[PDB]
Amino acid sequence: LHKEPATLIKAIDGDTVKLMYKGQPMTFRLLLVDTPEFNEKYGPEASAFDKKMVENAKKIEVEFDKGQRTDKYGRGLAYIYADGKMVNEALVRQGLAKVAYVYKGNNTHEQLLRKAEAQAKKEKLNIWS
Ligand SMILES: Cc1cn([C@H]2C[C@H](OP(=O)(O)O)[C@@H](COP(=O)(O)O)O2)c(=O)[nH]c1=O
Ligand SMILES: [Ca+2]
Numbered sequence: 001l002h003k004e005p006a007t008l009i010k011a012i013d014g015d016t017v018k019l020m021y022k023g024q025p026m027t028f029r030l031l032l033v034d035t036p037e038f039n040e041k042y043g044p045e046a047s048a049f050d051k052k053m054v055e056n057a058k059k060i061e062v063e064f065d066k067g068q069r070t071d072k073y074g075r076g077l078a079y080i081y082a083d084g085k086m087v088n089e090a091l092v093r094q095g096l097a098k099v100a101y102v103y104k105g106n107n108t109h110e111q112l113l114r115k116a117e118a119q120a121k122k123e124k125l126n127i128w129s
Contacts, residue, residue: 001108003061003081004090011054014036014046015097017080017087021062028087032113034100036110042126046096053090057082067105077111092116095125 009025013037015123035046053102054060063079071077080087088109091097092118102110121128 001063001065001079003063005058006062006087008054008057010059011047011051014043014050016075019062019076019080020076027075028062028078028080029071029073029076029119030091030097031079031106032099032102032109033088034096035091035092035097036127042096045126046091049091049094049096050087052106053087054080059083064085065108066105067103077106089113089116094119094121095128096116098127110114116118 004021006019006021007097009020011017012027015033018025019028030035035050036043038044038047058128061081063081065077065079086109089112092099092113099110099117106113
């Protein structure tokens with residue numbers, strides 16, 4: 001899999017972000033994770049955490065998996081990196097997201113993320129507290 005450029009347009013919530021990709025605005029939904037909706041517990045913390053990480057980043061990159069690149073809502077599905085660091089991973093590592101929505105064909109970083117959830121759970125962080 002390959003990292004590709006993108007630039008931030010707007011942080012939306014814990015697991016969606018508006019990016020410019022190939023010069024077009026699109027909403028991205030983070031692969032393999034589920035954050036709490038803003039209305040729910042840790043939702044604002046998730047949103048704040050995604051927001052901070054993407055807005056502070058000099059460099060954003062989009063990494064598509066091997067499967068579907070767009071969902072049924074027209075959202076791009078990807079791994080999103082902020083200065084070389086995966087946002088999908090960081091959210092899980094901090095207990096702000098669960099590993100989730102694991103579909104066959106779009107699951108390359110499954111085990112990497114499941115290692116991060118185990119650590120966050122060990123540590124009883126946020127959702128796991
Ligand atoms: C992460 C991801 C979500 N989805 C869809 C399934 C869910 O459908 P439903 O809307 O019918 O529940 C929805 C969950 O995303 P959200 O957590 O943003 O709502 O997005 C995919 O289709 N593929 C994916 O890889
Ligand atoms: Ca969600």
